[PDB]
Amino acid sequence: NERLEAILSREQNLLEETRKLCMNLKTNNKKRLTEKLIQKDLHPVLNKAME
Amino acid sequence: DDQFRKLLYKLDLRLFQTISDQMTRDLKDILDINVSNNELCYQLKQVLARKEDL
């Protein structure tokens, strides 16, 4: 029972880490779209790829 | 008058008193273990249920 408790604790830690990583990746992708390549520094030949 | 029969009767007192104490302790222990085994079986069933849920 203690061994399975340790296994469940490890799996729940992995689940929390994976969900946090997924949310962090989503917000990081949104912020990278918003703050890096949509600004005036975008090359005009990439204006159609963005479209 | 004689030690030799005196310590014979003293160790006889040892024998009878330890036998009486052993009788009482063994019978009380039989009843106590007979109920404690059922209590421990209930605890084992609870542990098995928690293990299945886990």
Swiss-Prot record, chain A:
Component of the kinetochore, a multiprotein complex that assembles on centromeric DNA and attaches chromosomes to spindle microtubules, mediating chromosome segregation and sister chromatid segregation during meiosis and mitosis. Component of the inner kinetochore COMA complex, which connects centromere-associated proteins and the outer kinetochore. COMA interacts with other inner kinetochore proteins to form the inner kinetochore constitutive centromere-associated network (CCAN), which serves as a structural platform for outer kinetochore assembly. It comes from the Eukaryota. Residues 1-31 form a coiled coil. It is found in: Nucleus; Chromosome, Centromere, Kinetochore. Present with 2688 molecules/cell in log phase SD medium. Belongs to the CENP-Q/OKP1 family. This is Inner kinetochore subunit OKP1. The chain holds residues 255 to 305 of 406 of the full protein. The gene is OKP1. Component of the heterotetrameric kinetochore subcomplex COMA, which consists of AME1, CTF19, MCM21 and OKP1. The COMA subcomplex is part of a larger constitutive centromere-associated network (CCAN) (also known as central kinetochore CTF19 complex in yeast), which is composed of at least AME1, CHL4, CNN1, CTF3, CTF19, IML3, MCM16, MCM21, MCM22, MHF1, MHF2, MIF2, NKP1, NKP2, OKP1 and WIP1. COMA binds the centromeric nucleosome-binding protein MIF2, and to the outer kinetochore MIND subcomplex. OKP1 interacts directly with AME1, with an NKP1-NKP2 dimer, and with CTF19-MCM21.
UniProtKB/Swiss-Prot annotation, chain B:
Signal peptide: none annotated. It is found in: Nucleus; Chromosome, Centromere, Kinetochore. It comes from the Eukaryota. Component of the kinetochore, a multiprotein complex that assembles on centromeric DNA and attaches chromosomes to spindle microtubules, mediating chromosome segregation and sister chromatid segregation during meiosis and mitosis. Component of the inner kinetochore COMA complex, which connects centromere-associated proteins and the outer kinetochore. COMA interacts with other inner kinetochore proteins to form the inner kinetochore constitutive centromere-associated network (CCAN), which serves as a structural platform for outer kinetochore assembly. Component of the heterotetrameric kinetochore subcomplex COMA, which consists of AME1, CTF19, MCM21 and OKP1. The COMA subcomplex is part of a larger constitutive centromere-associated network (CCAN) (also known as central kinetochore CTF19 complex in yeast), which is composed of at least AME1, CHL4, CNN1, CTF3, CTF19, IML3, MCM16, MCM21, MCM22, MHF1, MHF2, MIF2, NKP1, NKP2, OKP1 and WIP1. COMA binds the centromeric nucleosome-binding protein MIF2, and to the outer kinetochore MIND subcomplex, probably via AME1. AME1 interacts directly with OKP1 and an NKP1-NKP2 dimer. Belongs to the CENP-U/AME1 family. Present with 1630 molecules/cell in log phase SD medium. This is Inner kinetochore subunit AME1. It comes from Saccharomyces cerevisiae (strain ATCC 204508 / S288c) (Baker's yeast). The chain holds residues 163 to 216 of 324 of the full protein.
